[PDB]
Design an enzyme around this catalytic site. Structure first.
Site, PDB file in Angstrom:
ATOM      1  N   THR B   1       0.870  -1.211   0.000  1.00 29.87           N
ATOM      2  CA  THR B   1       0.000   0.000   0.000  1.00 29.87           C
ATOM      3  C   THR B   1       0.890   1.239   0.000  1.00 29.87           C
ATOM      4  OG1 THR B   1      -1.779  -1.144   1.168  1.00 29.87           O
ATOM      5  CG2 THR B   1      -1.821   1.259   1.251  1.00 29.87           C
ATOM      6  N   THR B   2       0.603   2.192  -0.874  1.00 27.12           N
ATOM      7  CA  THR B   2       1.258   3.514  -0.943  1.00 27.12           C
ATOM      8  C   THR B   2       0.164   4.560  -0.911  1.00 27.12           C
ATOM      9  OG1 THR B   2       2.832   2.571  -2.523  1.00 27.12           O
ATOM     10  CG2 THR B   2       2.893   4.953  -2.175  1.00 27.12           C
TER      11      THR B   2
END
Lengths: 228, 229
Positions: B1-2
């Protein structure tokens, strides 16, 4: 006889006599007066002293609810202090939970909801005080009056107590678009000195508070030099 | 996840990849980690999808009730503070790196990182998720504050792309949303039009010379790519 013993009971006419009777307690109480200006809001209350030997600041009827907001109590002071204590609990929930100074309109409705709660249930009685909520949060300078019924209303200017009628005549002489908080402290105090019964209530002082641009939008008692 | 959120003048850009992964398999290829709380206050959700969705829905519902009863717009500070209380209360039970970001007319564009501890830090820009670790050096080097709305969106997309190029746990679409005085502009960059990927970067075309034909010389030529040669 049974129509008026508790606040849980409507009469045939459709009204709640115990809340009307609580209201009588305010109308027999010491006169309070307030003004909402552009600069801020001002509350002045006459304190009728029973004794010559009280300290200055005894039976303070005006209490900071938050930085920006204060409740002046016209009515039974002890009852009023329960509202102040709740108004505080609401003001600190606004900062604790929502990270914001409670808005005046919100604080007022919260005070009205509380005072109303006590008009619905057989077990409790209505409050014996009208709260005057003065605030200068992000909704600007706001003056509200919660009465024993819980009925909130916003005011430019407002008189409560035994000189309610005559003090209102004098508040109607003021122009509210024009006047500053510094004028109002003078005129509101002057009004309370004028409407006061000299022969009935010999011992008294005029406690004034404000929350204005001058005071850093902080709800404080005004210094003793401005008061006359 | 970014997930990341940068401030421009008027407002903020939230940006996020689109991949939820059960470790090494991509469960969802097109998640929307930019989660509405109010009209102009979104959060970016990193960690347990279950936990952040649950918080984002709880906080969105509190903010909606709040907004109805004060009869005014909600401040981003309010959204951040609610989200902090919940992320803190449950800090042992949940895995939830949040970035609350939004516009309010009082404070303009605001970004709050609420990382795993339940700290709430007000920032010019915030990074979150597995992919955040790739961007700190990218921002230090390439981020210049006082960007245009357009430059921030281009930059935020370029950022998310740089993270998801290196993070296995990040990938897919780059979702952005600009929150300012104007109507929110969501946009979704598909991977085949991403501003950066290693696959298309000419730096990484020439293969590592790992294979190497059996030779009579220590001279490294290239990879052996034919059995005949």
């Amino acid at each position: 006889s049974g129509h008026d013993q508790s606040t849980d009971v409507f009469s045939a006419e459709g009204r709640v006599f115990q809340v009307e009777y609580a209201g009588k307690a305010v109308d027999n109480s010491s006169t309070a007066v307030a003004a909402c200006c552009k600069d801020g809001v001002v509350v002045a209350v006459e304190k009728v002293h029973t004794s010559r030997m009280l300290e200055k600041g005894s039976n303070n009827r005006i209490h900071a609810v938050d930085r920006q907001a204060g409740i002046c109590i016209c009515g039974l002071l002890p009852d009023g202090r329960a509202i102040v204590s709740r108004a505080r609990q609401e003001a600190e929930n606004s900062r604790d939970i929502f990270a914001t100074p409670i808005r005046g309109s919100v604080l007022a409705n919260r005070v009205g909801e509380f005072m109303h709660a006590y008009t619905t249930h057989f077990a409790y009685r209505p409050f014996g005080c009208s709260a005057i909520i003065a605030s200068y949060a992000d909704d600007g300078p706001q003056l509200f009056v919660s009465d024993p019924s819980g009925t909130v209303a916003g005011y430019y200017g407002v008189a409560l107590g035994k000189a309610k009628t005559v003090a209102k005549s004098e508040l109607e002489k003021l122009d509210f678009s024009s006047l500053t908080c510094d004028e109002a402290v003078g005129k509101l105090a002057s009004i309370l000195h004028e409407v006061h019964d000299k022969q009935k209530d010999k011992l008294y002082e005029v406690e004034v508070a404000w929350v204005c641009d001058k005071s850093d939008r902080k709800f404080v008692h005004v210094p003793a030099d401005m008061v006359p | 996840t970014t997930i990341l959120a940068v401030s421009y003048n008027g407002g903020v850009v939230l940006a996020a990849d689109s991949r939820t992964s059960s470790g090494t398999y991509v469960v969802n290829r097109a998640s929307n980690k930019l989660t509405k709380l109010t009209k102009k206050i979104y959060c970016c959700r990193s960690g347990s999808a279950a936990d952040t969705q649950a918080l984002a829905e709880r906080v969105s519902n509190y903010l909606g009730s709040y907004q109805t009863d004060i009869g005014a717009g909600v401040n981003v500070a309010t959204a951040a503070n609610l989200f902090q209380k919940m992320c803190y209360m449950n800090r042992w039970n949940i895995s939830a790196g949040i970035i609350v970001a939004g516009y309010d007319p009082i404070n303009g564009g605001s970004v709050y990182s609420i990382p795993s501890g339940g700290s709430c830090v007000k920032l010019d820009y915030a990074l979150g998720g597995s992919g955040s670790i790739f961007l700190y050096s990218f921002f230090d080097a390439n981020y210049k504050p006082g960007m245009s709305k357009s430059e921030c969106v281009a930059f935020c997309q370029r950022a998310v792309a740089h993270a998801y190029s290196r993070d296995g746990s990040s990938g897919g679409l780059i979702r952005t949303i600009t929150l300012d005085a104007d109507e929110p502009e969501d946009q979704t960059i598909p991977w085949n039009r991403s501003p950066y990927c290693m696959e298309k970067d000419p730096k990484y075309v020439t293969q590592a010379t790992q294979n190497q034909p059996f030779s009579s010389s220590a001279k490294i030529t290239g990879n052996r790519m034919s059995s005949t040669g």
